[PDB]
């Protein structure tokens, strides 16, 4: 009855395991990267990674290891799902069609058994004769590997050791033996077993059990030349081979605990290690003891290769390249320069893969431009937490790429008779001007006779009367079309260097000092048309034709624009575009179906104006903060009619339908200059030069989420937007180490120790307190901060540091009571390690004005403040279990008004209108209504169920959305039409779904246009959510008929589209929980419905062999096989 529709907008980006091997071919070195439900296959090249395929599996990738059984050339791929789905994939490409076929599949889940707290472990026999799996305590599941085992039939083997940490398969053994470390009451031990498939049980191990340190956690199987296992904990690294026993206690690995490893040598002579912090060690195996052929060890020295990202799964590619995956940071490709020793850090970064990471809290902001609301997340954690800004920016498809040394301008040029195309591109260096004739993909450059070799030419285009005049600093050189030789050269009257030169269809304008000279274009000749001297320096000028009806003049020292006749100097109109800085460029075209003009300056704002045809100058004063660097204006023919391109530090395209111009983003980090070019290979294309290189191509759909990162070097927790002050308020936490001299020292310079203005909260509203257990040396204290970040520059304007033991939890920007000021409000809580439940909390009200964060009110409460909201000018807070509402008095002091006592912890608060939704981690959804007449709270409904909720959200007055345990989603509903009190006082759980992610935060708003569309949209509303992995979903409501149609379409598609591993979709989306499992209802999968636009036409014809297409009233049972495509496209347009 919920009738919802959940669709992802961004794919998960957190790498949870990567591995290399020959998968696509017997010669390549493939790299496969699992991201959660997405499998990515790359081919490792000399210069980096070349993407090959992006395949989506119906499940959570929990185990991924490659094996090559005898009789095959390319490795297979055993992938296990967190829902216990096992498959053996194999790459299969036929020329151009690529499919991931499944050799064998099955389900390895047992009927009864508690999953191990150490999680699923999947290991493979080195000889590829068995697969070991640890799914439940004291049960080792063995999967025999045979050609006829298409069903993957496994059998259990009993482990007498209940607590087993890590299991691995040893190398170079006759029978398949396993080595593992297990916890027993005596301590920690390492034990070896021998697996017998015929006996279907264990036997005596190769070498007897030993004793390891109390922390020894992970085991590494050394290959055949050495033989044995290596066990590493935090204090010691040991090597066991039966009669051989080596051990070290290096002081380098003491600081952190090694969690991930990799082997870089085929014979296992060197290994890579990665700890929590992100320092990359390197274990070396010394093979100098070849006494009598046996390659035994001599020492176990450990090296340090320098700090890297927070490593979760290392992967050593060839040619000394390491892929350092990261679950909460950015995935990296580093290089082991083992010889360099820059500062002791051998590793140097080569690439970086973006990662939205653990989105902790997000906000949806509306920085002008109408709709297109930006989305700001507090991504990352520890030393790489950052803010990510996400938009909907059109992507640029570059058909070719050519490197340029930062060209100061590119113009088209024809090296042939005029064929309405340009086969030569003329660049402009700092002082030189290199021109290359590129009909196709040519790169050779040869200067022509008509163009000077080095003259710093600015404008070089096709002049009229079969000629071409290039204006240079020294003089303008004119070259005819067919002769291609110099015919005239009309230098400056003062022989000065023209700072700005304008080339038109038949007029050439040169600005020398404060004077200007316009010359009409004559056939193979130069003739002056007018000469004048402006009042001030000419900032910029342009002519927009044959004869330009009007011309523009800019003031460099005054920032004043004037309009004068092109062949004369008669002033027409004047205007001032703010006067902050001198304009950089100006232009005028028919982008908005009218002769609109624009002027761009070096403040990153553009001033628009409305110009008539013959003589008309309007104001149209509007400045938009497009960018943060100086711009450049250009017009590209590959558009609707002309449009306009503004290259900046965020490139923007001026798109207008009939009367509204929008600066749509362009998916590029930075664009320096761009110019249209009709190349023979790519006619009507655009050549854009960036700050480092240049590209040539076109544009595409808006289907792109451009992501800009702003590092903070500390963990960000909460964020809100303040429109009045135009700044973000974000909490952050830096982990600084206690010092023995008295005080604490920061580990690294974060965004709170590098701010403009900093303050320390000295408002000690309370005294005394206790701490008998003194803060010992080496302890790490988490110090909190409130940062006031800008919105278009992203610099920390203010950084307010709270008290000692001040864990700030909530943060809300709102204006309370009748006050006109917008106040920052933070609800903190004192936590001491001695006390369990905090007793003292604070509500502090900051007011960021004039660049200073002054405190207005500091309220003390008996408890902790978990979440805070606003009621039309009242502040509702949740002190521990109570729910308090605060009235803002005229004397700037919070005054309590009413209290509601909940037996649960009021942890999640989500309100709309007068209804209040309260919940806690145990998933106890409670409803409240504030009655203004009585001025007190009332309890409307309840829903109590033991489970781990993660986030809750309001969808409507009746429907309440929320995630819960095992990555599931539920929707509760209240039936106000219920006859009895009990029926309407209990929430009915109507919707269930299995998203596959741990949802952290819910929010309203959408990233797409807010266009009403007259007759509204098929989907009512939009709710975004961000998860731990990094995806961004979108839950929107639907009608009953649309829900039925989409449900039947999904059921029909489930029997047509094949899935890797042959996993049934209904089982994948089933509501999964340790205690019970029920099929999904009330939710429509978005990805599956969107996947209707890529399959082949016969598949569509099979899927659409029924239904009603437009409506049941019109029948249309055939449905024409295309109305459903239109419906799917209209659904896809929501994101």
CB of 122 to another protein, least distance (A): 11
User: Of 2, 10, 17, 879, which lies in the binding site for another protein, with binding defined by CB under 8 A?
Assistant: 17
Please answer whether residues 10 and 1031 qualify as being in contact, where contact means their C-beta atoms are separated by less than 8 angstroms.
yes
Residue whose CB is less far from another protein, 260 or 300: 260
Cα–Cα distance, 809 to 361 (Å, whole number): 12
Element (H, E) at 659: none
Residue 102's contacts (CB-CB under 8 Å, 6 or more residues apart) are 87, 88, 89, 90, 1060, 1061, 1062
Confirm or reject binding of residue 420 to another protein (CB under 8 A). Answer: no
Stretch that binds another protein, among 97-105, 221-229, 525-533, 947-955 (CB under 8 A): 947-955
Contacting another protein within 773-792 (CB under 8 A): 773
Nearer to another protein, 921 or 929 (CB): 921
Minimum distance from CB of 1075 to another protein (Å)?
Answer: 6
Among 225, 358, 651, 1005, binds another protein (CB under 8 A): 358
One of 922, 1009, 1057, 1125 touching another protein (CB under 8 A): 922
| Identity of the residue, 214 or 449, whose beta carbon is nearer to another protein in the bound complex | 214
Nearer to another protein by Cβ, of 20 and 1000: the residue is 1000
In the complex, minimum distance from the CB of residue 919 to another protein, in angstroms, rounded to a whole number: 13
Name the minimum Å distance from CB 772 to another protein. 9
Cα(427)–Cα(407) distance, rounded to whole angstroms? 6
Closest among 502, 471, 713, 652 to 587, alpha carbons compared: 502
Q: Minimal distance in Å, beta carbon 807 to another protein?
A: 6
- Nearest residue (CB) to another protein, 578 versus 833: 833
Hey, which residues does 461 pair with through a beta bridge?
none
Which of these segments, 110-118, 562-570, 747-755, 953-961, binds another protein (CB under 8 A)? 110-118
**Which 8-state DSSP code applies to residue 965?**
G
Name which position in 921, 929, 1105, 1115 contacts another protein (CB under 8 A): 921
Phi first, then psi, for residue 729 (nearest 5°) are: -110, 115
- The CA distance from 982 to 940, in Å, is 11
Beta bridge partners of 333: 323, 351
Question: Contact letters (x/-) for another protein, 148-187, by CB under 8 A?
Answer: ---------------x-xx----------------x-x-x
807 binds another protein (CB under 8 A): yes
Per CB under 8 A, which region of 568-576, 692-700, 715-723, 1062-1070 contacts another protein?
715-723
Please report whether residue 117 would count as binding another protein according to CB under 8 A. yes
Structure tokens at 307: 């700090």
Of residues 1092-1131, those binding another protein (CB under 8 A): none
Per-residue contact string for residues 209-228; x = within reach of another protein by CB under 8 A: -----xx-xx----------
Handedness of CA 856, 859, 863, 869 (dihedral sign): negative
User: Pick from 438, 607, 463: which is nearest to 523 by CA?
Assistant: 463
In sequence order, what E strands does 83-172 have?
85-94, 97-107, 121-124, 130-136, 139-144, 155-158, 163-169
Q: What 3-state DSSP class applies to 1093?
A: helix
Q: Which of 28, 361, 423, 592 binds another protein (CB under 8 A)?
A: 361
The pair of structure tokens assigned to 217 is 């956690």
Residues 732-761 touching another protein, rule: CB under 8 A, are none
Count of residues that interact with another protein, criterion CB under 8 A: 59
Tokens 């290089």 locate to: 335
DSSP string, 12-62: ------EEEE--S-SSS-EEEEE-SSEEEEEEE-SSSEEEEEEEE-SS-EE
CB of 64 to another protein, least distance (A): 11
Cβ nearer to another protein, comparing 137 with 897:
137
If one asks whether residue 614 binds another protein (CB under 8 A), the answer comes out as no
How many H-runs (helices) and E-runs (strands) does the chain carry? 6, 90
Read off the DSSP letter of residue 395.
Answer: P
Closest C-alpha among 773, 763, 906 to residue 832: 773
Identified binder of another protein from the candidate list 178, 831, 918, 1038, rule CB under 8 A = 831
Could you give phi then psi for residue 1087, rounded to 5 degrees? -65, -45
Most distant CA atoms of the chain, gap in Å: 104
Asked if 647 interacts with another protein (CB under 8 A), we say no
CA dist., res. 509 & res. 518, Å (int)? 4
Cα 861 to the center of its chain, rounded Å: 39
Residue window 377-396: x/- pattern of binding to another protein, with contact defined by CB under 8 A: ----xx--------------
Least distance (Å) from another protein to the CB of residue 278?
12
Applying CB under 8 A, which of residues 8, 16, 457, 973 lies at the interface with another protein?
Answer: 16
Across-strand partners of 909? 918
Residue nearer to another protein on the CB measure, 240 or 327: 327
Among 339, 420, 837, 891, binds another protein (CB under 8 A): 837
DSSP string, 785-847: EEEEEESSS--EEEEEE--TTEEEEEEEEE--TT--S-EEEEEEEE--SS-SS---EEEEEEE
Q: Which residues contact 341 (CB under 8 A, 6 or more apart)?
A: none
Which bin fits 128, alpha (ψ -120 to 50), beta or left (φ > 0)? left
d(CA 717, CA 947): 24
1075 part of the interface to another protein, by CB under 8 A: yes
Site string for another protein, 36-65 (x = CB under 8 A): --------------------------x---
Q: Which stretch binds another protein (CB under 8 A): 357-365, 476-484, 639-647, 1042-1050?
A: 357-365
Separation CA 858–CA 164 (nearest Å): 52
Q: What's the rounded Cα separation, in Å, for the pair 16 and 13? A: 9
803 interacts with another protein by CB under 8 A: no
- Which lies closer to another protein via its Cβ, residue 282 or residue 831? 831
Q: What whole-number distance in Å separates Cα of residue 533 and Cα of residue 537?
A: 9
One residue of 107, 109, 118, 462 binding another protein per CB under 8 A: 118
Contact 454, 473 (CB under 8 A): no
- Binding track over 301-320 against another protein, x by CB under 8 A: -----------xx-------
The residue count of the chain comes to 1135
Tokens 């800019």 correspond to what residue? 554
Q: Which helix (H) or strand (E) holds 691?
A: none
Q: Which stretch binds another protein (CB under 8 A): 135-143, 368-376, 495-503, 998-1006?
A: 998-1006
192 neighbors 210 (Cβ within 8 angstroms) = no
Q: Which stretch binds another protein (CB under 8 A): 497-505, 636-644, 833-841, 1034-1042?
A: 833-841
To which residue do tokens 């959940």 refer?
Answer: 6
Which of 967, 993, 1083, 1109 is the binder for another protein (CB under 8 A)? Answer: 967
Nearest to another protein of 717, 1135 (CB atom): 717
- Does residue 717 belong to the site contacting another protein (CB under 8 A)? yes
Query: Nearer to another protein by C-beta: 559 or 966?
Result: 966
Query: Tokens at residue 597, please?
Result: 């003009």
Is residue 501 a contact residue for another protein (CB under 8 A)? no
847 or 1000: CB nearest another protein: 1000
Selected binder of another protein within 18, 328, 705, 730 (CB under 8 A): 328
Of 807 and 1042, which has the nearer Cβ to another protein? 807
Cα(817)–Cα(269) distance, integer angstroms? 71
Chain contacts with another protein (rule: CB under 8 A): 16-17, 62, 115, 117-119, 163, 165-166, 183, 185, 187-188, 214-215, 217-218, 257, 259-260, 312-313, 327-328, 358, 360-361, 381-382, 715, 717-718, 773, 807, 809, 831, 833-834, 836-838, 905, 907, 921-922, 946-948, 950, 965-967, 998, 1000-1001, 1028, 1074-1075
């Amino acid at each position: 009855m919920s009738y919802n529709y959940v669709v992802t907008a961004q794919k998960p980006t957190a790498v949870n395991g990567c591995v290399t091997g020959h998968f696509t071919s017997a010669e390549d070195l493939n790299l496969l990267i699992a991201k959660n439900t997405r499998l990515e296959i790359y081919v490792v090249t000399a210069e980096g990674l070349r993407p090959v395929k992006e395949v989506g599996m119906y499940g959570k990738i929990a185990v991924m290891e490659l094996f090559r059984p005898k009789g095959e050339s390319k490795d297979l791929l055993f992938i296990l799902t967190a829902k216990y789905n096992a498959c053996i994939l194999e790459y299969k490409q036929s020329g151009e069609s690529i499919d991931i076929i499944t050799r064998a599949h099955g389900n390895v889940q047992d009927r009864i058994g508690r999953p191990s707290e150490t999680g699923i472990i999947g290991i493979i026999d080195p000889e590829c004769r068995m697969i070991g799996l640890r799914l439940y305590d004291g049960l080792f599941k063995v999967i025999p590997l045979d050609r006829d085992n298409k069903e993957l039939k496994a059998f259990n083997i009993r482990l007498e050791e209940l607590h087993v940490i890590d299991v691995k398969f040893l190398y170079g053994c006759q029978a398949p033996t396993i080595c593992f470390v297990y916890q027993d009451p005596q301590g920690r031990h390492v034990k070896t077993y021998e697996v017998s498939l015929r006996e279907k049980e264990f036997n005596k191990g190769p070498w007897k059990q030993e004793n390891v340190e109390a922390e020894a956690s992970m085991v590494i199987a050394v290959p055949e030349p050495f033989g044995g296992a290596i066990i590493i904990g935090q204090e010691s690294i040991t090597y066991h081979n039966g009669d051989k026993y080596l051990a070290i206690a290096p002081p380098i690995i003491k600081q952190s605990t090694i969690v991930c490893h990799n082997r870089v040598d085929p014979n296992g002579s060197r290994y890579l290690l990665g700890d929590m912090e992100g320092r990359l060690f390197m274990l070396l195996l010394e093979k100098e003891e070849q006494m009598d052929g046996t390659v035994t060890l001599k020492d176990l020295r450990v090296e340090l290769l320098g700090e890297t990202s927070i490593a979760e799964c290392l992967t050593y590619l060839d040619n000394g390249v390491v892929f350092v995956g990261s679950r909460l940071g950015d995935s990296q490709l580093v290089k082991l320069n083992v010889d360099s020793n820059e500062q002791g850090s051998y590793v140097v970064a080569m690439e970086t893969f973006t990662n939205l990471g653990p989105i902790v809290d997000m906000c949806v902001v509306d920085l002008e431009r109408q709709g297109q609301g930006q989305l700001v997340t507090c991504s990352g954690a520890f030393k790489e937490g950052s803010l990510r800004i996400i938009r909907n920016g059109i992507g640029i498809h570059e058909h070719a790429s050519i490197d340029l040394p930062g060209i100061k301008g590119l113009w088209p040029l024809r090296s042939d008779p005029n064929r309405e195309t340009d086969d030569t591109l003329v660049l402009s260096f700092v002082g030189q001007t290199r021109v290359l004739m590129l009909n196709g993909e040519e790169v050779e450059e040869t200067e022509l006779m008509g163009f000077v070799d080095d003259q710093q030419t600015f404008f070089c285009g096709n002049v009229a009367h079969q000629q071409l005049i290039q204006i240079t600093s020294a003089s303008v050189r004119l070259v005819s079309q067919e002769p291609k030789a110099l015919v005239s050269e009309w230098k400056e009257p003062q022989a000065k260097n023209i700072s700005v030169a304008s080339c038109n269809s038949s007029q050439v304008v040169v600005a020398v000092g404060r004077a200007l000279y316009y010359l009409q274009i004559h056939p193979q000749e130069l003739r002056q048309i007018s000469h004048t001297e402006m009042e001030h320096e000419v900032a910029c000028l342009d002519i927009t034709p044959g004869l330009s009806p009007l011309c523009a003049i800019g003031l460099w020292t005054d920032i004043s624009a004037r309009i004068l006749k092109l062949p004369s100097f008669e002033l027409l109109h004047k205007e001032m575009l703010g006067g902050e800085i001198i304009p950089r460029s100006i232009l005028m075209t028919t982008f908005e179906s009218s002769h609109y003009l624009l002027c761009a300056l070096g403040d990153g704002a553009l001033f628009y104006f409305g110009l008539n045809i013959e003589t008309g100058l309007l104001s149209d004063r509007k400045k938009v903060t497009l960018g943060t660097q100086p711009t450049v204006l250009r017009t590209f023919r590959s558009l609707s009619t002309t449009n306009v391109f503004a290259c900046s530090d965020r490139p923007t395209v001026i798109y207008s339908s009939n009367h509204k111009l929008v600066f749509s983003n362009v998916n590029l980090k930075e664009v320096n200059y761009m110019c249209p070019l009709n190349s023979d290979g790519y006619p009507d294309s655009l050549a854009l030069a960036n700050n480092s290189t240049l590209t040539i191509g076109t544009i595409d759909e808006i289907q792109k989420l451009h992501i800009r990162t702003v590092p903070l070097y500390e963990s960000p927790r909460k964020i809100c937007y303040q429109e009045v002050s135009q700044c973000f308020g974000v909490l952050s936490s830096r982990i600084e180490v206690q010092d023995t001299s008295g005080g604490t020292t920061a580990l690294r310079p974060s965004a709170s120790t590098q701010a403009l203005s900093s303050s320390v909260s000295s408002s000690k509203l309370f005294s005394s307190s206790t701490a008998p257990h003194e803060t010992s040396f080496g302890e790490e204290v988490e110090v909190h901060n409130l940062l006031i970040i800008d919105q278009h520059t992203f610099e920390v304007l203010h950084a307010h540091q709270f008290l000692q033991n001040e864990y700030a939890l909530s943060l809300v920007s709102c204006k309370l009571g009748k006050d006109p000021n917008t106040y920052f409000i933070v609800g903190t809580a004192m936590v001491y390690p001695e006390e369990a439940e905090p007793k003292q909390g604070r509500i502090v009200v900051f007011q960021y004005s004039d660049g200073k964060l002054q405190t207005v009110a500091e309220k003390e409460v008996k408890g902790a403040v978990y979440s805070m909201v606003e009621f039309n000018g009242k502040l509702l807070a949740s002190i521990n279990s109570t729910v308090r509402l605060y009235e803002w008095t005229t004397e700037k002091e919070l005054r309590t008004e009413c209290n509601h006592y909940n037996n649960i912890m009021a942890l999640y608060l989500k309100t709309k209108g007068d209804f209040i939704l309260v919940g806690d981690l145990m998933r106890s959804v409670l409803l409240l209504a504030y009655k203004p007449m009585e001025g007190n709270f009332e309890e409307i409904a309840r829903d109590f169920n033991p489970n781990w909720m993660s986030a809750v959200e309001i969808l409507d007055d009746d429907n309440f959305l929320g995630a819960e345990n095992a990555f599931n989603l539920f929707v509760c509903q209240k039936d106000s039409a219920a006859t009895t009190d009990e029926e309407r006082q209990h929430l009915q759980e109507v919707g269930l779904f299995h998203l596959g992610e741990f949802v952290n935060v819910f929010c309203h708003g959408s990233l797409v246009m807010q266009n009403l569309g007259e007759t509204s949209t098929p989907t009512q509303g939009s709710v975004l959510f961000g998860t731990v992995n990094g995806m961004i979903g979108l839950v929107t409501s639907l009608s009953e008929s649309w829900y039925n149609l989409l449900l039947d379409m999904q059921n029909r598609l489930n029997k047509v589209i094949k899935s890797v591993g042959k996993i049934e979709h209904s089982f994948w989306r089933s509501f999964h929980t340790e205690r019970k499992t029920e099929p999904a209802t009330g939710f429509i999968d978005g990805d599956l419905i969107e996947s209707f636009l890529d399959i082949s036409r016969p598949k569509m014809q099979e899927v659409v062999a029924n239904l009603q297409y437009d409506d049941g009233s019109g029948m249309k049972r055939e449905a024409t096989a295309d109305d459903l495509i239109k419906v799917v496209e209209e659904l896809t347009r929501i994101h």
